[PDB]
Amino acid sequence: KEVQSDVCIVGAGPAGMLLGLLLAKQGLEVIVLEQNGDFHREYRGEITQPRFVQLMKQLNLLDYIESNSHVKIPEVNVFHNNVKIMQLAFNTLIDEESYCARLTQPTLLSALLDKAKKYPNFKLLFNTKVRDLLREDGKVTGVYAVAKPNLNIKSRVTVGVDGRNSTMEKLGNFELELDYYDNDLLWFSFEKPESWDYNIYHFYFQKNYNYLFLPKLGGYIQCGISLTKGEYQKIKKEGIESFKEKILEDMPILKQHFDTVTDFKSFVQLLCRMRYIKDWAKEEGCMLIGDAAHCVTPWGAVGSTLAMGTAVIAADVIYKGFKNNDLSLETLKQVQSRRKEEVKMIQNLQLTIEKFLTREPIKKEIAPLMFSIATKMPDITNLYKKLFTREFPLDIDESFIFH
Amino acid sequence: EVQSDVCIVGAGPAGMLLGLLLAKQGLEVIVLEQNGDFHREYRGEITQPRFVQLMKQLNLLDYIESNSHVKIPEVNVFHNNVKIMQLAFNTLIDEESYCARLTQPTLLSALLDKAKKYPNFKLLFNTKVRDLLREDGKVTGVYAVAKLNIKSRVTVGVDGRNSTMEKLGNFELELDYYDNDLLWFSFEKPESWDYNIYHFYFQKNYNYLFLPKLGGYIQCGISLTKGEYQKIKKEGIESFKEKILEDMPILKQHFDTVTDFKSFVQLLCRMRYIKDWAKEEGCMLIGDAAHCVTPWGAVGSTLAMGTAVIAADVIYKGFKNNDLSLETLKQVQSRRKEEVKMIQNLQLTIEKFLTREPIKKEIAPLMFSIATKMPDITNLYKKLFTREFPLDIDESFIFH
Amino acid sequence: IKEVQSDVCIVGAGPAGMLLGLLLAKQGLEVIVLEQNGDFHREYRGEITQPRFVQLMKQLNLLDYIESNSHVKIPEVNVFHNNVKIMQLAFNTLIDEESYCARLTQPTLLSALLDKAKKYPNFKLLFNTKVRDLLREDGKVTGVYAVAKPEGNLNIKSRVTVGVDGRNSTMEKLGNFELELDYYDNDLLWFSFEKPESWDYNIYHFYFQKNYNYLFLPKLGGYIQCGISLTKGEYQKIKKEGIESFKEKILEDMPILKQHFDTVTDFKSFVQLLCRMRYIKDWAKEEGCMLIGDAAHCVTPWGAVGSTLAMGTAVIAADVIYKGFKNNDLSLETLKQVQSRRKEEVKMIQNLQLTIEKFLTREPIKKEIAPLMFSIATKMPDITNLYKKLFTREFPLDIDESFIF
Numbered sequence A: 001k002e003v004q005s006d007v008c009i010v011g012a013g014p015a016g017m018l019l020g021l022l023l024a025k026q027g028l029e030v031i032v033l034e035q036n037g038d039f040h041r042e043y044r045g046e047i048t049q050p051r052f053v054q055l056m057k058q059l060n061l062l063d064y065i066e067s068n069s070h071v072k073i074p075e076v077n078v079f080h081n082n083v084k085i086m087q088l089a090f091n092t093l094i095d096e097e098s099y100c101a102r103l104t105q106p107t108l109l110s111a112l113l114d115k116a117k118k119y120p121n122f123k124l125l126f127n128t129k130v131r132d133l134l135r136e137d138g139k140v141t142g143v144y145a146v147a148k149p150n151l152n153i154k155s156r157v158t159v160g161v162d163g164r165n166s167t168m169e170k171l172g173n174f175e176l177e178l179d180y181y182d183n184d185l186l187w188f189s190f191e192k193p194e195s196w197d198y199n200i201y202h203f204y205f206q207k208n209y210n211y212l213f214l215p216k217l218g219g220y221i222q223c224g225i226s227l228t229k230g231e232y233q234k235i236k237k238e239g240i241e242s243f244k245e246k247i248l249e250d251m252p253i254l255k256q257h258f259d260t261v262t263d264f265k266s267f268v269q270l271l272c273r274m275r276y277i278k279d280w281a282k283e284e285g286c287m288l289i290g291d292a293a294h295c296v297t298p299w300g301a302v303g304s305t306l307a308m309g310t311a312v313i314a315a316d317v318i319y320k321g322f323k324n325n326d327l328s329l330e331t332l333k334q335v336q337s338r339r340k341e342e343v344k345m346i347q348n349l350q351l352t353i354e355k356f357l358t359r360e361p362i363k364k365e366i367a368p369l370m371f372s373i374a375t376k377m378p379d380i381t382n383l384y385k386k387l388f389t390r391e392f393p394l395d396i397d398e399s400f401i402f403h
Numbered sequence B: 001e002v003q004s005d006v007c008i009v010g011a012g013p014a015g016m017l018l019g020l021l022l023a024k025q026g027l028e029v030i031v032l033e034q035n036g037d038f039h040r041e042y043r044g045e046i047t048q049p050r051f052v053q054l055m056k057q058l059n060l061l062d063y064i065e066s067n068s069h070v071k072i073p074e075v076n077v078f079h080n081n082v083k084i085m086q087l088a089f090n091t092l093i094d095e096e097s098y099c100a101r102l103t104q105p106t107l108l109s110a111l112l113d114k115a116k117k118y119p120n121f122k123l124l125f126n127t128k129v130r131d132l133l134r135e136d137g138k139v140t141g142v143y144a145v146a147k148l149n150i151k152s153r154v155t156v157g158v159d160g161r162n163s164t165m166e167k168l169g170n171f172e173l174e175l176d177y178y179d180n181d182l183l184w185f186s187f188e189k190p191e192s193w194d195y196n197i198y199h200f201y202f203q204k205n206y207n208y209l210f211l212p213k214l215g216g217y218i219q220c221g222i223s224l225t226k227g228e229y230q231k232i233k234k235e236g237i238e239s240f241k242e243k244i245l246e247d248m249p250i251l252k253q254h255f256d257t258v259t260d261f262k263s264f265v266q267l268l269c270r271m272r273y274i275k276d277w278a279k280e281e282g283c284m285l286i287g288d289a290a291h292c293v294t295p296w297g298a299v300g301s302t303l304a305m306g307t308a309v310i311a312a313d314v315i316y317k318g319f320k321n322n323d324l325s326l327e328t329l330k331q332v333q334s335r336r337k338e339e340v341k342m343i344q345n346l347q348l349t350i351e352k353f354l355t356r357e358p359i360k361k362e363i364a365p366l367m368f369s370i371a372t373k374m375p376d377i378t379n380l381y382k383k384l385f386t387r388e389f390p391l392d393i394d395e396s397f398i399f400h
Numbered sequence C: 001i002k003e004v005q006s007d008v009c010i011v012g013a014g015p016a017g018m019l020l021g022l023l024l025a026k027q028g029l030e031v032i033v034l035e036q037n038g039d040f041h042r043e044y045r046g047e048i049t050q051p052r053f054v055q056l057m058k059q060l061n062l063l064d065y066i067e068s069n070s071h072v073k074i075p076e077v078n079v080f081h082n083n084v085k086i087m088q089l090a091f092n093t094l095i096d097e098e099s100y101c102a103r104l105t106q107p108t109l110l111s112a113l114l115d116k117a118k119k120y121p122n123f124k125l126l127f128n129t130k131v132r133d134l135l136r137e138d139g140k141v142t143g144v145y146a147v148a149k150p151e152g153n154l155n156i157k158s159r160v161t162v163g164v165d166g167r168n169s170t171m172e173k174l175g176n177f178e179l180e181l182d183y184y185d186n187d188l189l190w191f192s193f194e195k196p197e198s199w200d201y202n203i204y205h206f207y208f209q210k211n212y213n214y215l216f217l218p219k220l221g222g223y224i225q226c227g228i229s230l231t232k233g234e235y236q237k238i239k240k241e242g243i244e245s246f247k248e249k250i251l252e253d254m255p256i257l258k259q260h261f262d263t264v265t266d267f268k269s270f271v272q273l274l275c276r277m278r279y280i281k282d283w284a285k286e287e288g289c290m291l292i293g294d295a296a297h298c299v300t301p302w303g304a305v306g307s308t309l310a311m312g313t314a315v316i317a318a319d320v321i322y323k324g325f326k327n328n329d330l331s332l333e334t335l336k337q338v339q340s341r342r343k344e345e346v347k348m349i350q351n352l353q354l355t356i357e358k359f360l361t362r363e364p365i366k367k368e369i370a371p372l373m374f375s376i377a378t379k380m381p382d383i384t385n386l387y388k389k390l391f392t393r394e395f396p397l398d399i400d401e402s403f404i405f
Ligand SMILES: Cc1cc2nc3c(=O)[nH]c(=O)nc-3n(C[C@H](O)[C@H](O)[C@H](O)COP(=O)(O)OP(=O)(O)OC[C@H]3O[C@@H](n4cnc5c(N)ncnc54)[C@H](O)[C@@H]3O)c2cc1C
Pocket: A010, A011, A012, A013, A014, A015, A016, A033, A034, A035, A036, A042, A043, A044, A045, A046, A047, A048, A128, A129, A130, A131, A161, A162, A163, A164, A165, A166, A167, A168, A270, A290, A291, A292, A301, A302, A303, A304, A305, A307
């Protein structure tokens, strides 16, 4: 039919809803739409970062979020053949509160939606699939979406906050400056052994594969086996049995779980892709932000916090434009002009870290020892601060501080 | 006053092997030494696969094994009590190769008993040489005191690293390296351990080296920086015992009866190289008097003995030709230059792993771990242990 | 102000500028090349080249003509660690063809191109002509304003204006261009000394020493030029300590230089070079405008890639302009194809240069392990791929046949 709004946003994920929550708080009619029927449709992680704690306390939101179901992870350890080689406590990085946490996204997103539904100028729809852009007069006017249990949404600003797989990246002719994919992860969950804590963050450098252990919702532990691009098809050929013999040789504590495994149906494959669009704001009334604009690898648990920080900067930029009645393409490029420095700093670190997961004949046996040497450098704590903490709060107007 | 044709000053490994190899050749050979017996001063017990190679070329391997010795098949390196490097010396070459715990006196005496059968061989004890009869630019012999002006065509010095003939001769030290120590002590073999072990440990406080000794007994050398032992003595023995016992918990029994440092022997790991081994006509320097090395790899005894073989071959060649001049003696340094210089350069690279600096001490175990995983470490193993080709000497020097 | 009318306008008569002019002149397009200097000998811009340069020359039937000039081939590069060699590389194994580093100087090569080009009547080159501004009309950049000296003021017009000045570019800011990246972390200190007796002449050597890192290259006239690597801002402190202290440390590292340093009693001999790397965001931004060369994609002086990398951009630029003229399509969309094709190699090189510049650290504990890490990396089973990517080009540049002499 026909709809009217001030700001149109595609997707209600961490970045989309944080932007929608804030923009409504500034007294602008917002619309946020998503295709899934709820927040539980797709699994999208549970771990967070110290940088996330900093952001919430910046807006006076930690107490509200901290009242949810979460488990504070106090440190990260790295092993090599079952012997610890590196330890890092997150509270020695910044004076204020600092810690990782296990906070599932649907828990976090429901907390944001509940706070946002208090405002009457915030509107969220679901099962709403954007399918086209209403670009007219050169500028962008809005989007065309089909709703489920056909409508045109016209707005002054359109923001694309879909995920890696972005439809809004192609309708607006955006171009990628980077396309990295060299590794996989193979995730499975198993019952916590009696000798193990629960709020752990453990990485193992073993003989055959590399393992990452994180807490899972419900007293379980989720493991991830690091593999190369295309090596999983070969693994399945050799059979499940040979996979078990090599895993149990690595981590014998997993003996009890693998007694009841007879197929590759308990494992889930994840592809570690990194991306970067060339120019996020390219057309009038158009912008791109989030993980459709600058994804990163699974290391350090930076993906969600980095996306949320981009939205917060986008809200301040948009707020300045609306008050000044200046929404030209010139004002939109401030998001990239302010986020670029910290997003590219993060991505270059992810490229360095991904070089330690090599499975090559001679490099596989020295990666653990290179890691052990690097972490003993006198100025390694600066890298820790860059990866986990943020030096200064995002400079945005006080109007965004919740009371 | 006694005349001879060859005068060797010192009867160590290098000196004796030169003397025997010349007495068998029908020359008048006299060997001088100062100690009252071969047992007075400790001079090591371990050997390397090059040592077996030298014997089998000389066809004396069977005779040597007839005397007492133990076999040490591999060498292992650990880090915080986990093995990081392993090597078997029998895979380095097709021929049979091993380390031997053959103590020196049971080797020197075996050389003496075999050597004295020849009537032109002569040996003396307590004959401390004092001056050289350097006359007309050449050595007429040596002046000594017994407890003698012995004139010879060649006067070869095998005194050792603490050489007294490095000053009588006007030799110049091309190198002098000294930046580490060792602290030796012997204790009883633990039940869980074996006897024929060659074990090196990278630990938190100190690095240790375990070797066999005395039969059912083990010796351990604690690596310390130069000038650092004088501090452990100033800070008391109680501190030292606790630090060792934390690092190496299986020493708890031996240290329960230790109350002082009088049982600890300080070995100074020195390395040296002479600018020109034979600078004047009539005398030459060979062995550890000229090209000593560090204790790593047990390459010292073989290096000095192999050079004595080179000296004997050249000396016999010169005698057969009757052309014994300055350029003749230089043939020894010309032919041993490649091995002696490559071996020392390796000893300098390994010594760099014994750093005790605040942050380097914790990276050195990791570097060693990486270096052993390189695509070509086995060529370095051969360089350190086995000789690629047999020493080129005429067939007359072999024993049937 | 007197007027001039041409078809293609280029600013600067360095390697990239001159090369592009020659290739455009051969096609029948009127070409004007402008330089501010008296001649090609005014500024000093190095004397070394790369196997990539040989590949580019012979692709256009030019190796023989260049080989006529005076040049000494360099067969290999060595890297030492305390007077001990830790790496060796002969350029002949990189590709099946003939590959090598020469030491041809720039004013020699530039004259070789100049004389060849001026045979075409459509080629014109001016000295002492300095560009001042950009003549933009009707939402386009048509021509420039230049002031000539031995005359007066000139007003050049063309369908295309190309920016081929150096890193210190005026066209960079006259047409407002944006630097995506800029990097500066090190300095080099160059001085020339008489070749010692034992050292050869056609050497390309690098030393990891106790105090400083030394690079030794050949110089014109049987001399040797040496560059000492220093951190940014460390040279001011070095001068404060004194010349006598600086000499003491250098002789410790390289005692072979003792004979040369007797006549050194100040810092007048030394020359300071700043290792700067750049990348222009959008090489083409205004209609009838472009940017190429070190004013676009400068790089650090490691691997001697800078001169050849610019000529690669000029060659692709000549194909870009050629296709537009034959198609009546000199819009911004066609012009942007220059970066769309050059972008890949330029950024691959810039990344390799930042990795290499990490080995020159002078930090208290890092500088003592960099020589050891270099030795570990070069012994990896897959190092030849890096060598091939740093010196040789896998394939020839896909330019038409008309550009072959
Ligand atoms: C398996 C997995 C595990 C992860 N684990 C972690 C972790 O532990 N920690 C962490 O920090 N990050 C993690 N991430 C990354 C995390 O998902 C991102 O950081 C975050 O989701 C980015 O926020 P966003 O706004 O882009 O959300 P999005 O996920 O992009 O939200 C939009 C959603 O809508 C979907 N969509 C696509 N097209 C449309 C359309 N036309 N209309 C509506 N919706 C559409 C998208 O696919 C997406 O699911 C994980 C990701 C994956 C895939």
